[PDB]
Amino acid sequence: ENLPPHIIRLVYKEVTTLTADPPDGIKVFPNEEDLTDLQVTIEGPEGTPYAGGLFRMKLLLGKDFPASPPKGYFLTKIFHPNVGANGEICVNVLKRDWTAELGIRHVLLTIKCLLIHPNPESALNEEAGRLLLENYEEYAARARLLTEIHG
Amino acid sequence: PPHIIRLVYKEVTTLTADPPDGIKVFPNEEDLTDLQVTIEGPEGTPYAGGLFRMKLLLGKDFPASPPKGYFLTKIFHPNVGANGEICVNVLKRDWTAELGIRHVLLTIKCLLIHPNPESALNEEAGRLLLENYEEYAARARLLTEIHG
Ligand code: NA
Ligand code: NA
Ligand code: NA
């Protein structure tokens, strides 16, 4: 696991809370064997090109969590300015205004909100970023089509 | 406007009974076309700890178009104009007439986390976010201290 013992206890508390009282459109599926590898699903919000899809993702809690944010991957394929070719979520997404008081609930809200409002100024998917900024309806069409297949 | 009154009533009932996290609605039966709301500034943003009062103005062409939104709490945010008006182009993105007040409110809450400076109504906040993020955040946090 490689987390300080009181951090493991805080993570256990938080994930157990998120299983019992999940945020809207988010589900967490903890594995008690390893709480640092967290499977999550986020519903694509209505009013976005991801509407109707279920987006599987993984959070990896590194040894410095929560001084540092976790790493996040989309396991569901997605056409999103801030999601790289291997599914990695752009590190500035979670680093911006990150403090050690933040946890998994914050990460998950930040990622869900990123589906509504990408940040194309820092696009890892340069094609998706350019389309969003320059021809929004074409970005949306491409993201919708991939959601139809993969979500 | 009759249709507006009918539509707002059903959704407002659900939003009062089962509000989204961080969001509260305060309907006034006298006029359901003008809807007062609060949104908690999310943690992990320059708005953290603030309570943001806002209102929606539902026009006669709702839900073909999104409602107009205003922040009533003063805010330093790329997508919020001098008079508190919330950028219409942002609320229009992927808008269709099956959408309602819940989507609008989630869209605005999530805009506090991820501004869209490419369409900044507040040119200074948009430029600072892109070119001097720490100054943007400092300015927004200081205003949240006073107004939130
Ligand atoms: Na939007
Ligand atoms: Na942010
Ligand atoms: Na953005």
CSV table of N, CA and C in Angstrom, one decimal, chain A residues 22-24 45-49 93 96-98 102 105-106 109-114 116-121 132-133 136-137 139-140 144, chain B residues 18-21 42-46 90 93-94 98-100 102-103 106-111 113-118 129-130 133 137 141:
chain,number,residue,atom,x,y,z
A,22,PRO,N,-22.8,7.9,-2.0
A,22,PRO,CA,-22.0,8.4,-3.1
A,22,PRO,C,-22.5,9.7,-3.6
A,23,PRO,N,-21.6,10.5,-4.1
A,23,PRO,CA,-21.9,11.7,-4.8
A,23,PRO,C,-22.7,11.4,-6.1
A,24,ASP,N,-23.6,12.3,-6.5
A,24,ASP,CA,-24.5,12.1,-7.6
A,24,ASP,C,-23.7,11.7,-8.8
A,45,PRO,N,-22.1,13.6,-17.6
A,45,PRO,CA,-23.3,14.5,-17.3
A,45,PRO,C,-24.1,14.8,-18.5
A,46,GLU,N,-25.4,15.0,-18.2
A,46,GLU,CA,-26.3,15.5,-19.2
A,46,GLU,C,-25.8,16.9,-19.6
A,47,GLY,N,-26.1,17.3,-20.8
A,47,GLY,CA,-25.6,18.6,-21.2
A,47,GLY,C,-24.2,18.7,-21.5
A,48,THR,N,-23.5,17.5,-21.8
A,48,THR,CA,-22.2,17.4,-22.3
A,48,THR,C,-22.2,16.4,-23.4
A,49,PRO,N,-21.1,16.4,-24.1
A,49,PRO,CA,-21.0,15.3,-25.2
A,49,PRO,C,-20.9,13.9,-24.6
A,93,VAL,N,-4.8,19.3,-13.9
A,93,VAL,CA,-6.2,19.3,-13.4
A,93,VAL,C,-6.3,19.2,-11.9
A,96,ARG,N,-3.9,22.1,-9.5
A,96,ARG,CA,-4.3,23.5,-9.3
A,96,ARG,C,-5.1,23.6,-8.0
A,97,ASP,N,-4.5,24.4,-7.1
A,97,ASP,CA,-5.1,24.7,-5.8
A,97,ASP,C,-5.1,23.5,-4.9
A,98,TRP,N,-4.3,22.4,-5.2
A,98,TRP,CA,-4.3,21.3,-4.4
A,98,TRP,C,-3.6,21.6,-3.0
A,102,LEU,N,-7.2,18.0,1.1
A,102,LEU,CA,-8.1,17.5,0.1
A,102,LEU,C,-8.0,16.0,0.1
A,105,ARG,N,-13.0,12.5,-2.4
A,105,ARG,CA,-14.2,13.1,-2.8
A,105,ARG,C,-13.9,14.4,-3.7
A,106,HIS,N,-13.0,15.2,-3.3
A,106,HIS,CA,-12.6,16.4,-4.1
A,106,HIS,C,-12.1,16.0,-5.4
A,109,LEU,N,-15.1,15.0,-7.6
A,109,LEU,CA,-15.9,16.1,-8.1
A,109,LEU,C,-15.1,16.9,-9.2
A,110,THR,N,-13.8,17.1,-9.0
A,110,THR,CA,-13.0,17.8,-9.9
A,110,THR,C,-13.0,17.2,-11.3
A,111,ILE,N,-12.9,15.8,-11.3
A,111,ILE,CA,-12.9,15.1,-12.6
A,111,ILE,C,-14.3,15.1,-13.2
A,112,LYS,N,-15.3,14.9,-12.4
A,112,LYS,CA,-16.7,15.0,-13.0
A,112,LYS,C,-16.9,16.4,-13.6
A,113,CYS,N,-16.5,17.4,-12.9
A,113,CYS,CA,-16.7,18.8,-13.4
A,113,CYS,C,-15.9,19.0,-14.7
A,114,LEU,N,-14.7,18.3,-14.8
A,114,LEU,CA,-13.9,18.5,-16.0
A,114,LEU,C,-14.6,17.9,-17.2
A,116,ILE,N,-17.7,18.5,-17.8
A,116,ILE,CA,-18.5,19.6,-18.2
A,116,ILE,C,-17.7,20.7,-18.8
A,117,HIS,N,-16.6,21.0,-18.2
A,117,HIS,CA,-15.7,22.2,-18.6
A,117,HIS,C,-14.3,21.7,-18.7
A,118,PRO,N,-13.9,21.3,-19.9
A,118,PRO,CA,-12.5,21.0,-20.2
A,118,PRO,C,-11.7,22.3,-20.0
A,119,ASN,N,-10.4,22.1,-20.0
A,119,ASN,CA,-9.4,23.2,-20.0
A,119,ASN,C,-8.5,23.1,-21.2
A,120,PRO,N,-8.9,23.5,-22.3
A,120,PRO,CA,-8.1,23.3,-23.6
A,120,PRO,C,-6.9,24.0,-23.7
A,121,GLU,N,-6.6,25.0,-22.8
A,121,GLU,CA,-5.4,25.8,-22.8
A,121,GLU,C,-4.2,24.9,-22.5
A,132,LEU,N,-12.5,21.9,-29.6
A,132,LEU,CA,-13.4,22.5,-28.7
A,132,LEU,C,-13.3,24.0,-28.9
A,133,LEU,N,-12.1,24.6,-29.0
A,133,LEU,CA,-11.9,26.0,-29.1
A,133,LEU,C,-12.4,26.6,-30.4
A,136,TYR,N,-16.7,24.0,-31.9
A,136,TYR,CA,-17.2,23.2,-30.7
A,136,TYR,C,-18.1,22.1,-31.1
A,137,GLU,N,-19.0,22.3,-32.1
A,137,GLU,CA,-20.0,21.3,-32.4
A,137,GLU,C,-19.3,20.0,-33.0
A,139,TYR,N,-16.1,19.1,-32.0
A,139,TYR,CA,-15.6,18.4,-30.8
A,139,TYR,C,-16.7,17.5,-30.2
A,140,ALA,N,-17.8,18.2,-30.1
A,140,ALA,CA,-18.9,17.5,-29.4
A,140,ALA,C,-19.4,16.3,-30.2
A,144,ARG,N,-19.3,12.6,-28.7
A,144,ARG,CA,-20.6,11.8,-28.6
A,144,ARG,C,-20.5,10.5,-29.2
B,18,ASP,N,-34.4,17.3,-2.8
B,18,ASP,CA,-33.2,16.5,-3.0
B,18,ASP,C,-32.2,17.4,-3.6
B,19,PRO,N,-31.7,18.4,-2.9
B,19,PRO,CA,-30.7,19.3,-3.6
B,19,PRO,C,-29.4,18.7,-3.9
B,20,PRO,N,-28.8,19.0,-5.0
B,20,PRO,CA,-27.4,18.6,-5.3
B,20,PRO,C,-26.4,19.1,-4.2
B,21,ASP,N,-25.3,18.4,-4.1
B,21,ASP,CA,-24.4,18.7,-3.0
B,21,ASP,C,-23.9,20.1,-3.2
B,42,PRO,N,-16.5,25.4,-4.0
B,42,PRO,CA,-15.8,24.2,-3.8
B,42,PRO,C,-14.4,24.3,-3.2
B,43,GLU,N,-14.1,23.3,-2.3
B,43,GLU,CA,-12.7,23.2,-1.8
B,43,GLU,C,-11.8,22.9,-3.0
B,44,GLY,N,-10.5,23.3,-2.8
B,44,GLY,CA,-9.6,23.1,-3.9
B,44,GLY,C,-9.8,24.1,-5.0
B,45,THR,N,-10.4,25.2,-4.8
B,45,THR,CA,-10.6,26.3,-5.7
B,45,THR,C,-10.4,27.6,-5.0
B,46,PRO,N,-10.1,28.7,-5.7
B,46,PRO,CA,-10.0,30.0,-5.0
B,46,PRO,C,-11.3,30.5,-4.3
B,90,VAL,N,-21.2,29.8,-22.5
B,90,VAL,CA,-20.8,28.6,-21.8
B,90,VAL,C,-22.0,27.8,-21.4
B,93,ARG,N,-23.4,25.6,-24.3
B,93,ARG,CA,-22.6,24.4,-24.9
B,93,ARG,C,-23.4,23.1,-24.6
B,94,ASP,N,-23.7,22.5,-25.7
B,94,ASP,CA,-24.5,21.2,-25.7
B,94,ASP,C,-25.9,21.4,-25.0
B,98,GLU,N,-34.3,19.3,-23.5
B,98,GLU,CA,-34.6,18.4,-22.5
B,98,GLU,C,-34.0,18.7,-21.2
B,99,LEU,N,-33.1,19.7,-21.2
B,99,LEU,CA,-32.3,20.1,-20.0
B,99,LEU,C,-33.1,21.1,-19.2
B,100,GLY,N,-32.7,21.2,-17.9
B,100,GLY,CA,-33.4,22.1,-17.0
B,100,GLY,C,-32.5,22.8,-16.0
B,102,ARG,N,-31.6,21.9,-13.0
B,102,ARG,CA,-30.6,21.1,-12.3
B,102,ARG,C,-29.3,21.1,-13.1
B,103,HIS,N,-29.4,20.9,-14.5
B,103,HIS,CA,-28.2,21.0,-15.3
B,103,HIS,C,-27.5,22.3,-15.2
B,106,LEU,N,-25.6,22.6,-11.9
B,106,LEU,CA,-24.4,21.8,-11.9
B,106,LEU,C,-23.3,22.5,-12.8
B,107,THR,N,-23.8,23.0,-14.0
B,107,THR,CA,-22.8,23.6,-14.9
B,107,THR,C,-22.1,24.8,-14.2
B,108,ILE,N,-22.9,25.6,-13.5
B,108,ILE,CA,-22.3,26.8,-12.8
B,108,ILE,C,-21.4,26.4,-11.7
B,109,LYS,N,-21.8,25.5,-10.9
B,109,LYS,CA,-21.0,25.0,-9.8
B,109,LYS,C,-19.7,24.5,-10.3
B,110,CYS,N,-19.7,23.7,-11.4
B,110,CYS,CA,-18.5,23.1,-12.0
B,110,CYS,C,-17.6,24.2,-12.7
B,111,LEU,N,-18.2,25.3,-13.1
B,111,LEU,CA,-17.5,26.4,-13.6
B,111,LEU,C,-16.6,27.1,-12.6
B,113,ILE,N,-14.9,25.4,-10.5
B,113,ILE,CA,-13.7,24.6,-10.4
B,113,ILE,C,-12.9,24.8,-11.7
B,114,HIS,N,-13.5,24.8,-12.8
B,114,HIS,CA,-12.8,24.9,-14.1
B,114,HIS,C,-13.3,26.0,-15.0
B,115,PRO,N,-12.8,27.2,-14.7
B,115,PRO,CA,-13.2,28.3,-15.6
B,115,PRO,C,-12.9,28.0,-17.0
B,116,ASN,N,-13.5,28.8,-18.0
B,116,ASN,CA,-13.3,28.7,-19.4
B,116,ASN,C,-12.8,30.0,-19.9
B,117,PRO,N,-11.5,30.3,-19.7
B,117,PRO,CA,-11.0,31.7,-20.0
B,117,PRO,C,-11.0,32.0,-21.5
B,118,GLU,N,-11.2,31.0,-22.3
B,118,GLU,CA,-11.2,31.3,-23.8
B,118,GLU,C,-12.4,32.2,-24.1
B,129,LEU,N,-5.8,34.2,-15.2
B,129,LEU,CA,-5.8,32.7,-15.1
B,129,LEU,C,-4.9,32.0,-16.0
B,130,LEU,N,-4.8,32.5,-17.3
B,130,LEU,CA,-4.0,31.9,-18.3
B,130,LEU,C,-2.5,32.2,-18.1
B,133,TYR,N,-1.5,32.5,-13.1
B,133,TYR,CA,-2.6,31.8,-12.4
B,133,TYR,C,-2.6,32.1,-10.9
B,137,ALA,N,-5.8,33.5,-8.7
B,137,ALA,CA,-6.3,32.8,-7.5
B,137,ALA,C,-6.2,33.7,-6.3
B,141,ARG,N,-9.5,34.6,-4.2
B,141,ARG,CA,-9.6,34.2,-2.8
B,141,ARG,C,-9.8,35.5,-2.0
